[PDB]
């Protein structure tokens, strides 16, 4: 790859510079090059990888939604341009999701390693299948939704066995799974019961908050609350 000749440590350094510069495509490329060195990522490096790719696909998702809304409104009561450009953005978005999922499958998702990394990467697999499912149609789409659900479920099982109920990866995973249930799977009740179970169980064991981590935990707990307020 284009990062093949750069040292891993230099790639990490440059991803951090790219984050400070708000250069998230560069950031993602640096982190892909770092993953391709074939060594595990630390918690901090997982954050770099996550932030970079989420920023990239987030801008694509937002663009896609704008164009899709224009497209649907031009299909109620003339030329091909809106559809074409929406397809162009859609294709790039799928390309970024394919890249992330390929990294997860080729390099990151392993049998061993700690529960944090195993849960995080399976959560990430669920997320990027979910983003593919937001734009999918037909025979492609059914297999995508099953893929997202199975990744999320495997992460859920590990998280419930191996992490405290306030752990921010466990909470973030449950938050994102509930979003999948509501927005993708058309299962509002499953989404609501998962969000409420997650919030309540975090509150019941609030003493398990970690001092290097509790701000993230309580942030997700509030986001579960906002979704429950939205959904009820």
């Amino acid at each position: 790859g284009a990062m093949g000749s750069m040292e891993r440590a230099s790639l990490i350094q440059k991803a951090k510079l790219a984050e400070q510069a708000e250069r998230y495509e560069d950031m993602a490329a640096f982190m892909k090059g770092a993953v391709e060195k074939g060594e595990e990522l630390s918690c901090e490096e997982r954050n770099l990888l996550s932030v970079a790719y989420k920023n990239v696909v987030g801008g694509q998702r937002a663009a896609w939604r704008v164009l899709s809304s224009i497209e649907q409104k031009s299909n109620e009561e003339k030329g091909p341009e809106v559809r074409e450009y929406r397809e162009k953005v859609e294709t790039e978005l799928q390309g970024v999701c394919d890249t992330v999922l390929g990294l997860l499958d080729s390099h990151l998702i392993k049998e061993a390693g700690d529960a944090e990394s195993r849960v995080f990467y399976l959560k990430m697999k669920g997320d990027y299948y979910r983003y593919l499912a937001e734009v999918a149609t037909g025979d492609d789409k059914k297999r995508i939704i099953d893929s997202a659900r199975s990744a999320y479920q495997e992460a859920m099982d590990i998280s419930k066995k191996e992490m405290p109920p306030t752990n921010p990866i466990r909470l973030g995973l449950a938050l994102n799974f509930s979003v999948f249930h509501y927005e993708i799977a058309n299962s509002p009740e499953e989404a609501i019961s998962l969000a409420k179970t997650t919030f309540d169980e975090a509150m019941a064991d609030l003493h398990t908050l970690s001092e290097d981590s509790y701000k993230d935990s309580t942030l997700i707990m509030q986001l579960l609350r906002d979704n429950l307020t939205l959904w009820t």
Binding site: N47, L48, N55, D127, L175, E183, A191, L223, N227
Partner: peptide, 10 residues
């Protein structure tokens, strides 16, 4: 208004 997912934090 769409559901909120896990945000970026660094």
């Amino acid at each position: 208004q769409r559901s909120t997912s896990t945000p970026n934090v660094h």
